[PDB]
Design a protein around this ligand. Sequence first.
Ligand SMILES: Nc1ncnc2c1ncn2[C@@H]1O[C@H](COP(=O)(O)OP(=O)(O)OP(O)(O)=S)[C@@H](O)[C@H]1O
Ligand SMILES: [Mg+2]
Lengths: 106, 698
Amino acid sequence: MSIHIKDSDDLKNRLAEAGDKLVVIDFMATWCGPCKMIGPKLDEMANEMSDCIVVLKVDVDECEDIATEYNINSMPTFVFVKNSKKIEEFSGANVDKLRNTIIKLK
Amino acid sequence: QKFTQLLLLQRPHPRSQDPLVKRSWPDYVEENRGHLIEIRDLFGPGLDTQEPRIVILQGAAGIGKSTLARQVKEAWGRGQLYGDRFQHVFYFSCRELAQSKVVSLAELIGKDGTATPAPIRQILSRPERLLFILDGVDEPGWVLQEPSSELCLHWSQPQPADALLGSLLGKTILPEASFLITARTTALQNLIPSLEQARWVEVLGFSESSRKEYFYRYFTDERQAIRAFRLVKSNKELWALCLVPWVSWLACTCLMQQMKRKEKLTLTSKTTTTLCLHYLAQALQAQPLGPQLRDLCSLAAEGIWQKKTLFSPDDLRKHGLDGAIISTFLKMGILQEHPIPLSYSFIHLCFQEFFAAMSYVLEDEKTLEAYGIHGLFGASTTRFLLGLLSDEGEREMENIFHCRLSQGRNLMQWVPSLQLLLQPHSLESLHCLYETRNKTFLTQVMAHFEEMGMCVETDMELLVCTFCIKFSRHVKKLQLIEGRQHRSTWSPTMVVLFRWVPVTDAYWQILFSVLKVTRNLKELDLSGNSLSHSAVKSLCKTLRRPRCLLETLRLAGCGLTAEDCKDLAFGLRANQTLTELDLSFNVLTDAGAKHLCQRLRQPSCKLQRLQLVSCGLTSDCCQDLASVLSASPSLKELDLQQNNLDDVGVRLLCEGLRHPACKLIRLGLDQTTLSDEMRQELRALEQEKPQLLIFSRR
Ligand SMILES: Nc1ncnc2c1ncn2[C@@H]1O[C@H](COP(=O)(O)OP(=O)(O)OP(O)(O)=S)[C@@H](O)[C@H]1O
Ligand SMILES: [Mg+2]
């Protein structure tokens, strides 16, 4: 399942509580089309293998500070963080490549 | 000032491209559906329940596709149009945005700023609540394509508008958004990414009521407007061409400039180019200097070549213009100065096109040579350039410029080029060729018009079609139909002019004025169309013209009245070429038939054939009809079927027919309801008259 981030405190709390599970942060907007057509796919993948992967949903409009902190402008963007440290990031709604990145980084 | 009304079509057929010419004839009439609409329904449901996403506004140059959207926005601002579906509207111009190359969503929102600047977050969280206005996607040389899609950029991030508007139209940023796209020419598939479903609105001009209010609402004093309207109505071709708001505005400006100091109103202009030259002559009062205007035309052509209208000050120096020349041009009014830092531009794109048309003729002395203007037959550049080479076109330029210039051979050499480039005949080509009002020209360039029929929409289009079809050789038959009652054959001499738009009493008023100097197109068909008394008066005026050569005319099922029949009979007196008159399925009375009977019995009016099927005539008028048969030496065939003529009428007609002077050969009379002895009398009459034949249904 996907968890919505409201502020930086919630973001750091989820990263702290994730432990050794791989973490994916997605940047999506209501007006964005690719974001809301790739969101269901990411949710299905998270449901399939929730024992190893956790997906976090953050809104750029409501969390501009988070976007400025992670230095991303284009959407959709998926950020992979391992042990509270970023390991990989990319932009684009390419379902196959994001599946591959999750598979390699899990 | 006030937004004069414009007609708008709602064709439920995508006008993307027609590579496979026209193919079957019913397909072509099916495509042009029409379905006129009001302003408060442009973004309505439509035929099905699927509301349109992108609305395209096509039309001619200056047709009004740059003010309709402004009126919509202003009306919403005062709250009288779409106050419940669009939370906000955004006004953008592609020509204005072409100058800058660094723009973003936040930047365009700030530049628009119709109200107090609202936060972007709530603007972008309501997709199906916004409207976007553009003033022509063809004015700049944009592509409007998104880069590889699959991603959207954040607002306030710099991006060329070429990819930004393309992303907006590509269902990427603000996907469910309504776009008020305005275009001049069709085939926007290359310019619009995956357009597919779109509402194709065709912008028309000013109808009779709209022209009335526009001419009334232009001056201050009522008498000035009254005399202006009277003169414009007197010049019929100006009435036909004043549909376009540009033409009406130019005519009104010319009238005001004439009436300014001391002049009498005189407009012999019958085409757009001649009116433009007359306006230029009014602006060029005296001023013997000529090279300055040539340099202005050259700069206009150079600007239109590189998709430019806003001329930079340095571009004026390289073309020879100086401070005094610019001051004089502003003083007269060809150029305008905006509250913008130093720059100059024309007052309209159409004048820029007109001046780009004169530089070519001033420097020259096929479609490849039209690369700078482009749009074969789809650009008013070609229209003005062609019309400037006519005898009337090459008549006013010789006063502004002291050069003699070519005498008709600069158009004779254009004849083979156009003739080679006019195999796919079209309406815009017809406007371009009509702009050249020459008998010598329009006899080899249009003597290939072997069409089968086409759509006629406007008054100027009808005038152009009549003028061009007349100046040919193959056509003999001209037919006009209301379209729903489409019943026509496929003869090579058949041209089918169909309309699916309701018109005011000017469709025939302007058509009857074109039958002057008629060519071999003698036969005329207008059956089915509903006329009025004034239209019939105009038709009889046309029949009265000495040089009119109408040989056979039919008026079947036009809902004629008895009063107009007297006018028709009077019009027939000044005619010696009409031979066949058809009044089948018409509503006449005994007195109406009396008016025809008075003229028919005269030795003149050599009408060989006459049809009176279903005219409701009774036995009262058979006395006059019998007098006609017993007096007229020219009636060869007469039809009187579908008439409740009873026994007395048949006996009266037999008295007339028995006269040896009768010239009738074949007559149509009903005999089902006649008595037993009536068939015996008719049989004996036919026996004693072998040249007499009576026919019926079957
Ligand atoms: N409803 C209207 N009422 C009064 N004047 C009008 C109306 N519509 C257009 N005009 C006049 O038409 C001229 C402006 O026409 P535009 O719509 O700007 O031409 P256009 O569509 O831009 O053609 P282009 O430049 O070739 S794309 C001005 O002189 C206006 O006064
Ligand atoms: Mg425009």
